Design a protein around this ligand. Structure first.
Ligand SMILES: NS(=O)(=O)c1c(F)c(F)c(S(=O)(=O)CCO)c(NC2CCCCCCC2)c1F
Ligand SMILES: [Zn+2]
Length: 257
């Protein structure tokens, strides 16, 4: 029943999910001047060569591309992480206009959108179980700015007209998420939470410093999606971002100087 609107959006979520007011909620503003360079952090290992995309779905909040995560096929390790995290899905958050849409901010700057690649720690066996653990998930966050097109995104944007309204899905195989990554894997990292209900405090966030560029046409297709189900009043799926939450005692670490 939650969403992003005036009566059911982020300021209301604490009533159903009191963890919304917890000590490690996400997203956050990344103050780049107070982030601590940690020379002991590892390079992030992203191993997406054998990834198997399966389907794309409009769930009424975002859209999400789900992967075969029953094998060790698309894994994140290294960086701040201990052990192996398997990719289960990615999704995006975006704005009604180019000056907003990201969840994280950088020195208060909002990006047009943010891509989240969600991974779960294999020591917990399954994504639901992992979501109940303090080190259960690792989410790789990538900012999107509007400028030149990202050719690797086009396969995603071109099927969005088939999943316009809540509950629609389609097969979506052979999508390579490597085509969504920027050149650099320099990153900030901090302990946080899911940014949607149930808001569990189970995420190690890894947010890349380098944005990708996407074109105005690509992001316009995101904005044609609908929050509503077919046959309810039309509400365009825009501004599906949670604003920055208090950092509380946490340190953000940088992998770079
Ligand atoms: N931003 S985020 O990465 O914290 C996020 C979402 F915004 C999001 F919408 C989803 S969702 O569509 O699946 C809706 C429920 O929050 C997940 N998904 C993860 C969290 C759900 C629990 C199971 C663990 C892996 C999926 C999710 F991780
Ligand atoms: Zn997200």
């Amino acid at each position: 029943h939650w969403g992003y609107g005036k009566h059911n959006g982020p300021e209301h979520w604490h009533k159903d999910f009191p963890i919304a007011k917890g000590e490690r909620q996400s997203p956050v503003d990344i103050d780049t001047h107070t982030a601590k360079y940690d020379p002991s952090l590892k390079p992030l290992s992203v191993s997406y060569d054998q990834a198997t995309s399966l389907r794309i779905l409009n769930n009424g909040h975002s859209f999400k591309v789900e992967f075969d995560d029953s094998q060790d096929k698309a894994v994140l390790k290294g960086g701040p992480l201990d052990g192996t995290y398997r990719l289960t899905q990615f999704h995006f958050h975006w704005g009604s206009l180019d000056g907003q849409g990201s969840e994280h901010t950088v020195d208060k700057k909002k990006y047009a959108a943010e891509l989240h690649l969600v991974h779960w720690n294999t020591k917990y066996g399954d994504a639901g179980k992992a979501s109940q653990q303090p080190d259960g998930l690792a989410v790789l966050g990538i900012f999107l700015k509007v400028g030149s097109a990202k050719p690797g995104l086009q396969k995603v944007v071109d099927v969005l007209d088939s999943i316009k309204t809540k509950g629609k899905s389609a097969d979506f195989t052979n999508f390579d998420p490597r085509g969504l990554l920027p050149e650099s894997l320099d990153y900030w990292t901090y302990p946080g939470s899911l940014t949607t209900p149930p808001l569990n405090e189970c995420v190690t966030w890894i947010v890349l410093k380098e944005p990708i560029s996407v074109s105005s046409e690509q992001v316009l297709k995101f904005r044609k999606l609908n929050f509503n189900g077919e046959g309810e009043p039309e509400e365009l799926m825009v501004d599906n971002w949670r604003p920055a939450q208090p950092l509380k005692n946490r340190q953000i670490k940088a992998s770079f100087k």
